[PDB]
């Protein structure tokens, strides 16, 4: 059975852990427990192909930025998540992609850009300004909401199909 090594990066508080908890146990959490580096896994059939998802949740805080070089080396795909409310998360998401492209010298690496917190009815990041950044990176873009399960399956499923294209 094929296994996919997915990594979820982003800034602090963007809701990258609630996306994973909403995937495995379909539970939404409100208590912000900062994560250092936890790993999850759950199998599911995608495009008629049963597979395994090796999800690795990272830390959004700049405190544990030294551990970035490790999980950016073993990760097959990447799930760049930013907060729609936090404008800084959309700014320093550039520093994450260029750092991935440094450890992995290949410019085209499996990666999708995810816009979490879309359920919050106070949008700050333009809905269309992420596509031109996704087109400049050459990667898909999904708007997800950890509180209503909206698109959190498609965003993870799209990354699994994105890794298939990079071979």
């Amino acid at each position: 059975m094929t296994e996919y090594k997915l990594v979820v990066v982003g800034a602090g508080g963007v809701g990258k852990s609630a996306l994973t908890i909403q995937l495995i146990q379909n539970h939404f959490v409100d208590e912000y427990d900062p994560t250092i580096e936890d790993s999850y896994r759950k199998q599911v059939v995608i495009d008629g192909e049963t597979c395994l998802l090796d999800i690795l949740d990272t830390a959004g805080q700049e405190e544990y930025s030294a551990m970035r070089d490790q999980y950016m080396r073993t990760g097959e795909g990447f799930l760049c998540v930013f907060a729609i409310n936090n404008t800084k998360s959309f700014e320093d998401i550039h520093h994450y992609r260029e750092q991935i492209k440094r450890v992995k010298d290949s410019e085209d690496v499996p990666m999708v850009l995810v816009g979490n917190k879309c359920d919050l009815p106070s949008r700050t990041v333009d809905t269309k300004q992420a596509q031109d950044l996704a087109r400049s990176y050459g990667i898909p873009f999904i708007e997800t909401s950890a509180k209503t399960r909206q698109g959190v399956d498609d965003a993870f499923y799209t990354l699994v199909r994105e890794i298939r294209k990079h071979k």
Binding site: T35, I36, E37, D38, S39, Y40, R41
Partner: peptide
């Protein structure tokens, strides 16, 4: 100290982890 706590899922004895400080 930051410690990595591993656990074995019973079916296929594959491991997941928590990292505690």
């Amino acid at each position: 100290i930051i410690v990595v706590i591993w656990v074995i899922v019973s079916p296929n004895n594959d491991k997941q982890k928590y990292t505690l400080k």
